[PDB]
């Protein structure tokens, strides 16, 4: 019992809201408008500013995470590399935004050693996610070092929530992965944008539902209908 600081009503409310919102944003459930976690957003934007696209061969991931640490996201190096590994696996993640280079894991459950052993770069889908970014598309903010600028939300070109899902940590509130087939999703986007009132049965006509990265069998169209209602 060391600190004896008493008069802490609104300051414990403000500090508690601050630490709770920092949990919810940084280490928890991602956004609607691009479906990407802030760790993931800083991964994609840092690898964009390094220009590590598929025209060049793969680069060492330790340098990318070090530039993430020095510019955008001052947190665990192994956590940033955990996001790197999970994003760059075909079974762990539906459409691999990062294309890697080296041993990452297996469906049996395996991990890479560290960020300085294997290489990575952006795949053909991150260039889609970052096409037309530098053109007053999404407002930047100043980050923790007040010299770098980061994007608030990545300007998506395909809705990545339905594609890749949101795994969630509950501090009361957790969230799940509905994956989707990209083409049926885009057709659903087209039909919603055409008719402002399409019934969800008529979009279950469009969307089957969970397009898993390894395939399965889905039992229950009733729970599917409950979910998309």
């Amino acid at each position: 019992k060391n600190l004896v600081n008493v008069n802490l009503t609104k300051e414990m409310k403000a500090s508690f809201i601050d630490y709770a919102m920092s949990v919810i944003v940084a280490r928890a459930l991602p956004d609607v408008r691009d479906g990407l976690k802030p760790v993931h957003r800083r991964i994609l934007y840092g690898m964009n500013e390094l220009g590590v696209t598929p025209d060049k061969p793969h680069k060492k991931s330790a340098r990318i995470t070090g530039d993430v640490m020095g510019k955008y996201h001052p947190h665990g190096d192994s956590s940033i590399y955990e996001a790197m590994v999970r994003m760059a696996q075909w079974w762990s993640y539906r459409y691999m935004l990062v294309d890697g280079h080296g041993n990452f894991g297996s469906m049996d459950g395996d991990s890479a050693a560290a960020q300085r052993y294997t290489e990575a770069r952006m795949s053909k889908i991150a260039l889609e996610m970052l096409r037309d970014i530098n053109k007053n598309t999404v407002d930047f903010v100043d980050n923790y070092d007040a010299n770098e600028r980061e994007p608030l939300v990545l300007p998506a070109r395909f809705p990545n929530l339905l594609v890749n899902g949101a795994t969630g940590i509950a501090v009361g509130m957790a969230t799940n992965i509905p994956p989707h087939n990209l083409g049926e999703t885009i057709d659903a986007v087209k039909l919603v944008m055409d008719n402002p009132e399409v019934t969800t049965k008529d979009l279950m006509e469009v969307l089957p539902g969970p397009d898993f990265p390894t395939g399965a069998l889905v039992m229950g169209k009733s729970g599917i209908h409950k979910a998309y209602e």
Binding site: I186, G209, M219
Partner: peptide, 18 residues
């Protein structure tokens, strides 16, 4: 969006059974 659909869209590895 249809350009993206041409460039990437596979089909369901998962079968919706009943």
């Amino acid at each position: 969006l249809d350009e993206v659909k041409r460039k990437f869209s596979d089909k369901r590895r998962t079968e919706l059974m009943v």
